[PDB]
Each structure stands twice: as structure tokens, then as C-alpha cells.
């Protein structure tokens, strides 16, 4: 599923991402935009053999288990396939655990490069929430 910007903003608000761990809603919408372009089925194979999964490109070496990554730690205690659903529940649950680490949203490279430091609020502006 490819989410509309406002559609994802509303969904993420329902999923309690607004202000979670001190991060405003705009951060999450912006992250999804640059990490997966709002595509829930997005996947990207990495050099270390790991794969980034879903709307928030969650990595198989640290967060989810896809059964095909070397030093997989499965910190989110969940199969990577669950993060490929049109239902964002699992991706949000895991993203909350990820962001709860001291590194915060820096875990998302696209977010760091295209969102951090910008007017993230603009991503939820002009939406029926």
C-alpha cells in the first residue's frame, strides 16, 4: 500500500506517534516519505546482507528477523514480514522501540539526511487530522 501524506499522518496519530519520545508527528511522516516514499511494501537489500523493511525501512540485522541475516539480533522480537503489511501496527510498535534508544530517530538515515533540521511540521500541515 502506498499511503497519501495526510492519510499516513492521520494513521500515525491514531498509532500514537505524535510526541512519542519527544518527537513530533511531522518527523514520522517525513521519515516515511524519504525512507520508503510512503510504500508499506518497500524493501532494500544492504551490503552486510541485511534488508530494510516496510514504510519505515526497519533493518533485519538489529530489529526484525527475516531469517536471512548474519548477526541478526531481532531487538523488536518480530518477523520482518510483519513490517511489510498494509497495516502499520507492527512497524509503529517496532519504530517506538527503536526510537526509545538514546540514538532516537538518528536510526533512520533518510530522516537524518532529509528531515532533521527542516520544518517537519510542514508534513502534517494542510491535513484533516
Amino acid at each position: 500500500k502506498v499511503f497519501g501524506r495526510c492519510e499516513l499522518a492521520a494513521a500515525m496519530k491514531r498509532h500514537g506517534l505524535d510526541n512519542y519520545r519527544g518527537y513530533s508527528l511531522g518527523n514520522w511522516v517525513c521519515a516515511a516519505k524519504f525512507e520508503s516514499n510512503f510504500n508499506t511494501q518497500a524493501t532494500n537489500r544492504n551490503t552486510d546482507g541485511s534488508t530494510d523493511y516496510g514504510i519505515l525501512q526497519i533493518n533485519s540485522r538489529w530489529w526484525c528477523n527475516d531469517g536471512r541475516t548474519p548477526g541478526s539480533r531481532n531487538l523488536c522480537n518480530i518477523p520482518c514480514s510483519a513490517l511489510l503489511s498494509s497495516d502499520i501496527t507492527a512497524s509503529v510498535n517496532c519504530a517506538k522501540k527503536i526510537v526509545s534508544d538514546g540514538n532516537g530517530m538518528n536510526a533512520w538515515v533518510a530522516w537524518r539526511n532529509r528531515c532533521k533540521g527542516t520544518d517537519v511540521q510542514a508534513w502534517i500541515r494542510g491535513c484533516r487530522l
Partner: antibody
Amino acid sequence: DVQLQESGPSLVKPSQTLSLTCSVTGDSITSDYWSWIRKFPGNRLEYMGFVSYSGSTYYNPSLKSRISITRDTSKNQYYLDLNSVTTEDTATYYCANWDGDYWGQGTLVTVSA
Amino acid sequence: DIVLTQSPATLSVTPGNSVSLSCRASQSIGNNLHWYQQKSHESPRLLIKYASQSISGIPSRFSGSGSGTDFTLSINSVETEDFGMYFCQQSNSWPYTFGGGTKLEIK
């Protein structure tokens, strides 16, 4: 599967450091976030803090910096150090993973002269 | 700190009947409210996570509802194994906090 178990003294004196150990069996401590929670005599629960995979910690401000949470991979255990305890620290201490699906059995620690 | 207020403090019920327990937050916490059950000589047991998400291994009779500041835990047809303490906990902001708890007992 995963098992957690608390161990340490059940009786401590005021002003001393209370130290508890949580042994994890079934998987590496490097594969989860680890927490410490306690229940006071009044059926009041307090989330003490947790340590995440990177080593970053979160401590409850209520503890006034008296708490320390550390880990030891080689022994697959994590710890709780609470300094300068008072009778106010008498409680049942529990270790659990951050998700809340794995809990220890809890251990009562009494602070008394 | 976010304050969680639970009510009623105590609730008596006859097995077979249903009940609902309330938890109100001092400020909005989205869906970041979890429910725990706790019996004497036992550690807490997670029943519902993130306001309404079910947990594998928990009886289906338990369900959670709510968002923002008002939440409820419902038990459809209480069983004797359900008597004990119930606590809500929020993870929206550190420090995570717990409600004062609601005691469920046989009437």
C-alpha cells in the same frame, strides 16, 4: 525460550547500596532492552529505569541519581545498583524486558536498621 | 510526570458478569497505554499493549479501548482466575508511570 530471575540480598541497612542481579537465560541480553520495576508496600508500582541495546539508560527522576543499571554479556546478566537507600526503598523488585512480556519472579528487599 | 488515575479503586463482581476498569491520563498519551494484571506473590502480566492490541497467550475475554486521556480495560464474563490487581501504564513520556490500580474481587 526466555527466563529472567532476580537474585541478591533481601535485607539491607539504611545508607548502603542495594545491588540486585537479573539472570537472563534463553537468549543474549544484547538482543533486548532491559528494565527494573518495583512495587512499594502500598500496591504502588514504580518504573525505575531501563537500558537499551546501545547502552543508553533512562532513570526515573524520582531516584535522584541514586540508580545505576549495567550489563555483563559474558554472564548474560544485567544489574541494579541503588545507592544510599532508606526505609522508603523497601519494596518488591522485578526485572523485565522493555516489551513487558518477560518478567522475573520479583524479590522483596527490606531496608531496616 | 504524567499521572494515571484509575477507578474504581475496588470492584466486586460475580463470576460470569462483565466489568470495565478506567484509567485517565493527566495529559494526552495517544495510544501508549498498557494494561497489567497482578496477583499476590506474582509479577505483573501484560494483558493489552498500546490501548487495544491483544497479546498472544492472554484470554480473549480481555479487551482494551481508548485514546488520548481516557482508557478502559474490559473483561467479558469474569472468571475466578481474573481476581487480582489491574494496573495501567503509559509509555508516551519518560518516566513511564503506572496508575494506582484497581482491585477486582468476588462479590
